Amino acid sequence: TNLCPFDEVFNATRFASVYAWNRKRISNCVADYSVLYNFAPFFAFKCYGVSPTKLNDLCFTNVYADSFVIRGNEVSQIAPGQTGNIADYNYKLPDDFTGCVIAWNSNKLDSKVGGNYNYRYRLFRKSNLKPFERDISTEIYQAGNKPCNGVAGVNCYFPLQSYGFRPTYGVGHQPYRVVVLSFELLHAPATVCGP
Amino acid sequence: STIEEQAKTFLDKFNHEAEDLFYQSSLASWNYNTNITEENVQNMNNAGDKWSAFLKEQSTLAQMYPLQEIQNLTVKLQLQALQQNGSSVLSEDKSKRLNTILNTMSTIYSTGKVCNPDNPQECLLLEPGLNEIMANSLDYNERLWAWESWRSEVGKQLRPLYEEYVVLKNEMARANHYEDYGDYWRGDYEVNGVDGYDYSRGQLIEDVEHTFEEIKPLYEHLHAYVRAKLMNAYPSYISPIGCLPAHLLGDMWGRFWTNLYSLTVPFGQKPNIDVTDAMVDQAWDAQRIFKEAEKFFVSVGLPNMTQGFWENSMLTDPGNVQKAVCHPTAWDLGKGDFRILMCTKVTMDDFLTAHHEMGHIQYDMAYAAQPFLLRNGANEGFHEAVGEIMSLSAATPKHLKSIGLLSPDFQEDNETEINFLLKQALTIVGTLPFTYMLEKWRWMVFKGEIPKDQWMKKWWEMKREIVGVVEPVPHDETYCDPASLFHVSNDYSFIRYYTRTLYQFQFQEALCQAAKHEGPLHKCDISNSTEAGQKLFNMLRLGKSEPWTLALENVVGAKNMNVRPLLNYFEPLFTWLKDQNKNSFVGWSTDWSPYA
Ligand SMILES: *[C@@H]1O[C@H](CO[C@@H]2O[C@@H](C)[C@@H](O)[C@@H](O)[C@@H]2O)[C@@H](O[C@@H]2O[C@H](CO)[C@@H](O)[C@H](O)[C@H]2NC(C)=O)[C@H](O)[C@H]1NC(C)=O
Ligand SMILES: *[C@@H]1O[C@H](CO)[C@@H](O[C@@H]2O[C@H](CO)[C@@H](O)[C@H](O)[C@H]2NC(C)=O)[C@H](O)[C@H]1NC(C)=O
Ligand SMILES: *[C@@H]1O[C@H](CO)[C@@H](O)[C@H](O)[C@H]1NC(C)=O
Ligand SMILES: *[C@@H]1O[C@H](CO)[C@@H](O)[C@H](O)[C@H]1NC(C)=O
Ligand SMILES: *[C@@H]1O[C@H](CO)[C@@H](O)[C@H](O)[C@H]1NC(C)=O
Ligand SMILES: *[C@@H]1O[C@H](CO)[C@@H](O)[C@H](O)[C@H]1NC(C)=O
Ligand SMILES: *[C@@H]1O[C@H](CO)[C@@H](O)[C@H](O)[C@H]1NC(C)=O
Ligand SMILES: [Zn+2]
Structure with missing residues (x-):
């Protein structure tokens, strides 16, 4: 029997930055959520709408798995109705969201001595971000009244900035890997549900 | 867009x-201070050079936002720190001359030797x-030899x-829109803006003089006794x-009168309290010392120590x-990294130094959420005051009996109390007039009221x-005696000690009143008092985001520096000294001289 591919999402070797997060569509399979309870240390396992125990006997149409990596003190920012840099310029959740959020520490895999500068996030954006939207543009942000002409300088900034993760940081500044599961039941026949 | 938004974005890119x-x-710097190797010195120099270059480059870019356009009281404070010019207002030749003068004075002080x-x-x-x-000789001519030779x-x-x-230092101050260098130093206590909490740069002198007019009787009696x-x-x-x-x-x-204790002990038969033997007889280590200090800090509501601390x-x-620098220090590396550097030994002195350093660490932990430029004490005096108030509470006999270092059948008499009070006074009260003199003299020299001759x-x-x-x-105009001190040859401010000494007793009195203590103030322990920790935490977590007057008011109820709590601490000693000086002359005459 074809089990759903939850292993290649949770156990992937490399994750993605917040401004370019990874989305995977899951359909035409049977879902076993008990294997999700592996990786015993979970910093956060929260569920809105469905309940974790009753999730097995519920049939849906599609499941979306979204993966990225953030720092420690921003996990509480991955809930409905939150404000901040991550929830306004990087990743936004709807106020009617149904589904689950999982976040766990990855200090032993995403931290290097001297700095891990391969993880980036967005700091400046002209407007807020609509739910489930991606922005991968790298245009110069103008913060004045004079044109930038595509060159960084006075009142002109580069939107994306790195983290630097090092193994001696605190808990709030350590890397955390985050996976968000969203369940959609559309007017198509239900296909995805458990044993 | 408005200048305020532009400044906010600039500060956002800075703070990152x-x-x-x-x-x-x-x-x-930490790696250089733990090991000692040429490679570590090179890395430290490179890192410092990069940091200095970054800060100098960012200071210039902040001069585009006028300070009067912004009304936020939090963006303005960060921009005021960055907009400071410093020695960059001088010509290059004068800057090199000033640096050469400073280096030459430091080298002369550091490598000065006297040959017999x-x-x-x-x-x-x-x-x-x-x-x-000068600390262990009872001869007269030998002390004079070194005193005149140095x-x-x-x-x-x-x-x-x-x-x-x-x-040279007056020109820079006048170029930075000041009156002189003393005004530049005094500008650390200035508060402009918020109503009801303003402080001027000229009020400090008046406050210091008004306070010192109240310490004179106790110092006079101590001087007469000595x-x-x-x-x-x-x-x-x-x-x-x-x-x-x-x-x-x-x-x-x-500067201090501690080394006169053996000559001025009130009752020499009764020894002081020393718990070193009990510490050794129970197999104590540095780990247990720091665990006890952590337990003491947790008992009042403050948090634990981070896992990276251990x-x-x-x-x-x-x-x-290895080869390290054995000087106690509390390090706040940033990004949640807190560490203590200390070569701990089994002794009461290290037992109190651990409390001092962990008080510093807690105070650092309090304001970790504030912006980068506002992560510091309210002024140059609140940090060591919080450090010392922890050490006062940990040395009481009640605290020692509570943790088992002292026998439970130990009864405290009224003579060891006088011994302890005199030991404290020989160090705390004996240094205030010296500091007040030194700063008054330097202020008058910088202002120009004292001609060079x-x-x-x-x-x-x-x-x-x-x-x-x-x-x-006798001495003439070919000497510079004030320059013989470390803080004069090396450019440093020195009124911080007066301010901290006055702040610490106010803090202790407030916390003891919060803890419902009954009796003399020097018998106070703030352990097992949550209400005394929340009041301290309300001030600890502000940092530089608020004026120091408001931060003081959050703890003591008043908004000015006061001396009465210091006098309530030494009252039994004052009474005993007044009783002892009933057959002597209190005061001195300015005419007698040994060389007359
Ligand atoms: C601080 O309190 C602890 C705990 O004592 C309890 O809590 C207090 C608030 C108070 O209500 C006490 O009556 C409680 O017993 C003290 O540690 C205990 O001290 C007693 C003294 O007889 C001793 O019998 C216990 O074994 C101790 N418990 C331990 C060490 O876990 C502590 O002494 C207090 N600190 C002081 C008084 O300075
Ligand atoms: C720090 O110094 C710079 C120049 O060295 C000051 O900037 C000048 O200020 C004057 C004041 O009238 C202006 O006329 C100039 O246009 C400014 N720029 C230059 C390049 O001279 C700056 O004001 C100083 N900082 C402070 C706080 O006064
Ligand atoms: C993830 O992959 C590693 C490496 O093969 C494996 O040891 C581990 O068991 C995997 N995780 C789970 C939950 O199976
Ligand atoms: C720092 O000290 C450790 C401890 O012995 C040593 O192994 C290391 O080589 C030292 N660093 C340098 C640069 O020598
Ligand atoms: C000052 O600006 C900060 C920016 O975050 C804001 O939070 C604060 O409320 C402002 N102060 C006032 C008095 O509006
Ligand atoms: C502090 O740590 C000790 C031991 O690790 C623990 O028993 C105690 O509950 C901790 N206190 C807090 C406030 O977490
Ligand atoms: C201490 O108590 C004794 C007991 O009567 C008393 O005689 C003495 O005056 C008190 N004070 C001092 C300083 O000894
Ligand atoms: Zn200290």
């Missing part, structure tokens, strides 16, 4: 590249050497440098109505394998009038 650069400099007469093969440095003669060789080689130093007891060790050199010679105070300058901190001497004269007219000390031999 400054943290990384500062963390890389701090880690390099008619014997080139025996020369003594300041530390060790003359500092031991100010004859080292002192007279620094005056021409000091004159041009003053001349003078009476010093006549029995030097029978034919002390006048009963005169001033104390400057070479008989247990220190090279007279892994990245060095609490013992490495040994012969009347420096030393004034330095020896105020000492007889405020401190009550007289020079043993």
Whole structure:
């Protein structure tokens, strides 16, 4: 029997930055959520709408798995109705969201001595971000009244900035890997549900 | 767009590249301070150079936002710190000359040696050497020899440098829109803006003078008692109505009077409290000392220590394998990294130093959420005050009996109390007039009220009038005695000690009132009192985001520096001293001199 591919999402070797997060569509399979309870240390396992125990006997149409990596003190920012840099310029959740959020520490895999500068996030954006939207543009942000002409300088900034993760940081500044599961039941026949 | 939004964005990009650069400099400095190797020195130098270049480059970019356009009281504070120019307002030649003068004075002070007469093969440095003669000798001529020698060789080689130093440092201050260098130093206590909490740069002098007018009786009685007891060790050199010679105070300058305890003990038969033997007999280590300090801090509601504290901190001497700098220090590397550097030994002194350092660490942890430029104490005085108030509470006999270091059948009498109070007074009360004199003299020198040909004269007219000390031999305008001190040859401010000493007793009185303590103030322990920890935390977590007057008001209820809590601490000693000085003369005359 074809089990759903939850292993290649949770156990992937490399994750993605917040401004370019990874989305995977899951359909035409049977879902076993008990294997999700592996990786015993979970910093956060929260569920809105469905309940974790009753999730097995519920049939849906599609499941979306979204993966990225953030720092420690921003996990509480991955809930409905939150404000901040991550929830306004990087990743936004709807106020009617149904589904689950999982976040766990990855200090032993995403931290290097001297700095891990391969993880980036967005700091400046002209407007807020609509739910489930991606922005991968790298245009110069103008913060004045004079044109930038595509060159960084006075009142002109580069939107994306790195983290630097090092193994001696605190808990709030350590890397955390985050996976968000969203369940959609559309007017198509239900296909995805458990044993 | 408006200037305010532009400034906010600029500060957002600053607060993100400054943290990384500062963390890389701090880690390099820590690595140099644990090991010792040329490679570590090179890395430290490179990191410091990068940090300095970044800060200098970012200071120029902040001069585009006028300060009067912004009304936020939090963006303005960060921009005011960045917009400071410093020595960049001078010409390049003058900047090089000033740096050369500072380096030359530091080198002259650091490597000054005095050779004994008619014997080139025996020369003594300041530390060790003359500092031991001036702290452990009961002779008269030997102390005078070192006292005159240090100010004859080292002192007279620094005056021409000091004159041009003053001349150059006044130009920078006048170019930075100040009156003089003393105003530049006093600008750290200035509060402009918020109503009901404003503080001017001229109010500090008036406050200091008004406070010092209330310490005079207790200091006079202590001076009389010390003078009476010093006549029995030097029978034919002390006048009963005169001033104390400057070479008989247990220190090279007279900053502290601790080393006179063995000569001035009230009751010499009864020993003090020393828990070193109990510490050794119960197999105590540094780990247990720090665990006890952590437990004491947790007992009042403050949090634990981070897991990185127990892994990245060095609490013992490495040994012969490594080579470290054994000076206690609390490090806040940033990004949640807190560490203590200390070569701990099993002794009461280290037992109190651990409390001091972990108080510093807690105060650092309090404001970790504030912006980078506002992560510091309210002014230059609140940090050591919080450090010391922890050490006062941990030395009480009640606290020692609570943790088992002292026998539970130990009864405290009223004589060891006087011994302890006198030991405290010989260090706390004996240094205030010295500090007030030194800052008053430096302020008057910088202002211009003391002509260059009347420096030393004034330095020896105020000492007889405020401190009550007289020079043993005459001096002329070829000496610079004030330059013989570390904080004068090296550019540093020195009123911070006065402010901290006055703040700490206010804090202790407030916390003891919060803890419902009944009795003398010096028998106070704030352990097992949650209400006394929340009040402290309400001030600890502000940082520089609010004026120091409001931060003080959050703890004491008042918005000004006060002296009465200090006087309530020493009341039994004051009564005992008044009873003891019933057959002596209190006060001194400014006419008697040993060389008359
Ligand atoms: C601080 O309190 C602890 C805990 O004592 C309890 O809590 C207090 C608030 C108070 O209500 C006490 O009556 C409680 O017993 C003290 O530690 C205990 O001290 C007693 C003294 O007889 C001793 O019998 C216990 O074994 C101790 N418990 C331990 C060490 O876990 C502590 O002494 C107090 N600190 C002081 C008084 O300075
Ligand atoms: C720091 O110094 C710079 C120049 O060295 C000051 O900037 C100048 O200020 C004057 C004041 O009238 C202006 O006329 C100039 O246009 C400014 N720019 C230059 C390039 O000279 C700056 O004001 C100083 N900082 C402070 C706080 O005064
Ligand atoms: C993830 O992959 C590693 C490497 O093969 C494996 O040891 C581990 O068991 C995997 N995780 C789970 C939950 O199976
Ligand atoms: C720092 O000290 C450790 C401890 O012995 C040593 O192994 C290391 O080589 C030292 N660093 C340098 C640069 O020598
Ligand atoms: C000052 O600006 C900060 C920016 O975050 C804001 O939070 C604060 O409320 C402002 N102060 C006032 C008095 O509006
Ligand atoms: C502090 O740590 C000790 C031991 O690790 C623990 O028993 C205690 O509950 C901790 N206190 C807090 C407030 O977490
Ligand atoms: C201490 O108590 C004794 C007991 O009567 C008393 O005689 C003495 O005056 C008190 N004070 C001092 C300083 O000894
Ligand atoms: Zn300290």
